Amino acid sequence: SGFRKMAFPSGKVEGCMVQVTCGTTTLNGLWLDDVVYCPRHVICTSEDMLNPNYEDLLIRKSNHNFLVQAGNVQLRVIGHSMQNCVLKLKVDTANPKTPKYKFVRIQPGQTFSVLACYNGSPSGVYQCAMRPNFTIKGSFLNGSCGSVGFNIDYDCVSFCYMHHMELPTGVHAGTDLEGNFYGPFVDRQTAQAAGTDTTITVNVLAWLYAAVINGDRWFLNRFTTTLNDFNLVAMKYNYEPLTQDHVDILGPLSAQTGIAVLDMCASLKELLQNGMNGRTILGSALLEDEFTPFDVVRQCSGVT
């Protein structure tokens, strides 16, 4: 029993972290096979940040201008190319610690773990969610760029995020491992405001199921609702609309607890309308939305 915000074990990703320096800018890189992936803004100088022309800035850079260090040993760069907002630095050595891996582009609401690094060294690991406005609420300081987000299926690490920047509001923006940003953000020091950070409704429902499985049942009401009635309340509270795909995804949680998904929606509706009244659910005073239905099943079943 007990339910925690849990990240994947980070060892497989720790063995991929390298330090990338270009000029006087140092950030993190991800070393998979003989390629090191890093944010292309590693080539930007103090002020280039305002309006960078990456193709132009890259012309003044050769293989020898990218310094890659793995541990305390230097890697030889034999090629470099820009793919969208990431630089791919071909090195002469395949990473001996390369795990089985995939590059995936996740949808909003999906969770992943982040291994926060500085100077190619890991400092910590935490669990995140891709917000519905395509930002992430991470914990990233200067030099954390190039830190990655990932999920693990047994022995296969699926990399889904690479950190690039912090918006003026303190929220974070980044790309998938093909260099495409999540959302409308650009790697440029300009006014970029995020959209509405709505609550991931399917995730809140999964976490309410986790609470029931763990003995926290006080919020269970005597009511039911429909997807249409529930969604009218959800829109009012800045919650994402719930679809029949979400109801289907919650099916195993509904089966395990005997609580129909629409009954849990009605309980959530009452929590939104009445508040918590100073009560807590799984040690939290607000409705948690950074656990997917898959995360609830995984944690509640002990998937290794």
Distance CA 120, CA 114 (A): 14
DSSP 12: H
Under the criterion CB under 8 A, does residue 4 sit at the interface with a copy of itself? yes
Candidates 184, 195, 251, 275: give the one binding a copy of itself (CB under 8 A).
275
User: Using CB under 6 A, which residues numbered 166 to 205 contact ligand VEJ?
Assistant: 166-167, 187-190, 192
Catalytic residue among 145, 164, 172, 265: 145
DSSP 179: S
Under the criterion CB under 6 A, does residue 142 sit at the interface with ligand VEJ? yes
Question: 3-class DSSP state for residue 183?
Answer: coil
Distance CA 131, CA 116 (A): 18
Helical spans, DSSP H, in 124-243: 201-213, 227-236
Q: Which is nearer to a copy of itself, 225 or 292 (CB)?
A: 292
Under the criterion CB under 8 A, does residue 302 sit at the interface with a copy of itself? yes
Q: Which is nearer to a copy of itself, 81 or 169 (CB)?
A: 169
Question: 3-class DSSP state for residue 213?
Answer: helix
Candidates 59, 73, 141, 193: give the one binding ligand VEJ (CB under 6 A).
141
- Name the one range near ligand VEJ by CB under 6 A: 3-11, 134-142, 226-234, 249-257: 134-142
Under the criterion CB under 6 A, does residue 118 sit at the interface with ligand VEJ? no
| Whether 64 is catalytic | no
Distance from chain centroid for Cα 180:
14
Distance CA 129, CA 289 (A): 8
Q: Which of 292, 259, 30, 21 is nearest to 162 (CA)?
A: 30
| Whether 164 is catalytic | no
Biggest distance spanned by C-alpha atoms of the chain: 68
Under the criterion CB under 8 A, does residue 122 sit at the interface with a copy of itself? yes
DSSP H or E run through 88: strand 86-91
Chain residues in the site for ligand VEJ (CB under 6 A): 27, 41, 44, 49, 140-145, 164-167, 187-190, 192
Chain residues in the site for a copy of itself (CB under 8 A): 1-12, 14-15, 115-119, 121-126, 137-141, 143-144, 166, 170-172, 214-215, 275-276, 278, 280, 283-286, 298-304
